[PDB]
Ligand binder design. Structure first.
Ligand SMILES: Nc1nc2c(ncn2[C@H]2C[C@H](O)[C@@H](COP(=O)(O)O)O2)c(=O)[nH]1
Ligand SMILES: Nc1nc2c(ncn2[C@H]2C[C@H](O)[C@@H](COP(=O)(O)O)O2)c(=O)[nH]1
Ligand SMILES: [Mg+2]
Ligand SMILES: [Mg+2]
Lengths: 194, 194
């Protein structure tokens, strides 16, 4: 009866796309790269693999490296918006994130990143899972278009958060977008309340 | 429509109680300790704090230390039972665990422990959260008596897994126990199926 909102981390709170591109270019300066505006499809390494052989593996090595997740910059307005959202009456916010398969740094750095931008008390709001459909809530704000898993009927409405990779996608009505944290996330929340 | 079962980690799959006691005694050999049979109440540091001042903090330092979670032994039958359970038709198993507040090692070591005993492919089945009520499923097998959080009506039935700390507790009917992994977990699963 508190409205419950799941907010994805990478591509919603944390600027994974920009951080990746920057780090890829510093480490592989004589390789071709995908400009952010040219990004298409969720999977970064797939697009890089299509661009040139061997490049999928180089791309992967960026996000597998120490400090990659920790050093991601917040997306504009993300921190302010989630902090306001969590302080709203009758509203519980969880940060829901799918860690990569290589687990040496990513889980740790995600907790550390949340501590840095939201504070120790916000660590209680983290959910790490590869399956978001088994987390129940009224809303999921997430930049991945296709969110599936073990539950064929999730309780949340998926609101697509705009990113380079999905900005041109035509969704099936009545699927809805949140265009950036400057867009009116409060009205989306209010539309789900009694 | 696949039956979905959440299986807690510490005190259900991983022998947190035995591992803690062993490590506490090697590190603090001239301190009093709580024998496993004398354990009461979920919170280990609370009982240790009652036993002597300063001892809560020493207890905490054990599970905050590097390799504490990684080096926990599986509880008897736990690995075999969960592997069988996951291979059953129309049955999805997730391992659901609440990491401690100090996040340097615990998340990482939990993924590592799952990889060691269940294999890389089982990493997809991990859910880390401090709030289990927001994970939906038919069953939650968990040794903690009081499982609460943001969802006042969880979709799972909590089956209490026996541990030293809870073995004397009288539950409110119709709450049910799984007494150990030698006990008949298949009949509990079957009672929830259509
Ligand atoms: N394995 C893999 N992971 C990717 C690729 N592209 C992006 N990712 C990462 C970015 C995020 O860390 C993660 C998805 O997590 P999420 O934003 O929580 O849905 O996947 C890719 O091509 N391959
Ligand atoms: N902070 C704290 N954690 C405890 C205490 N006793 C046990 N724990 C840990 C054991 C597990 O790692 C964790 C509970 O996780 P879970 O088994 O998933 O419900 O809490 C205690 O007194 N204080
Ligand atoms: Mg994302
Ligand atoms: Mg437990």
């Amino acid at each position: 009866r508190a409205l419950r909102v799941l907010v994805n981390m990478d591509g919603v709170l944390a600027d994974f796309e920009g951080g990746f591109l920057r780090k890829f270019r510093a480490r592989f300066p004589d390789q071709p790269f995908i400009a952010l505006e040219d990004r298409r499809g969720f999977w970064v390494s797939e697009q890089y693999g299509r661009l040139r052989p061997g490049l999928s593996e180089k791309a992967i090595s960026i996000w597998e490296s120490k400090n990659f997740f920790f050093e991601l910059e917040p997306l504009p307005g993300a921190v302010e918006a989630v902090k306001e959202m969590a302080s709203l009456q009758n509203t519980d916010v969880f940060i829901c994130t799918s860690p990569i398969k290589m687990f040496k740094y990513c889980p740790y750095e995600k907790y550390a990143w949340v501590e840095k931008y939201f504070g120790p008390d916000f660590l209680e709001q983290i959910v790490l899972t590869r399956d978001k459909t088994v987390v129940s809530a009224d809303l999921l704000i997430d930049d991945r278009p296709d969110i599936t898993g073990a539950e064929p009927t999730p309780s949340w409405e998926h609101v697509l958060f705009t990113a380079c990779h999905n900005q041109h996608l035509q969704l099936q009505p009545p699927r809805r977008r949140l265009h950036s944290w400057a867009d009116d996330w409060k009205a989306i929340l209010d539309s789900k309340r009694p």
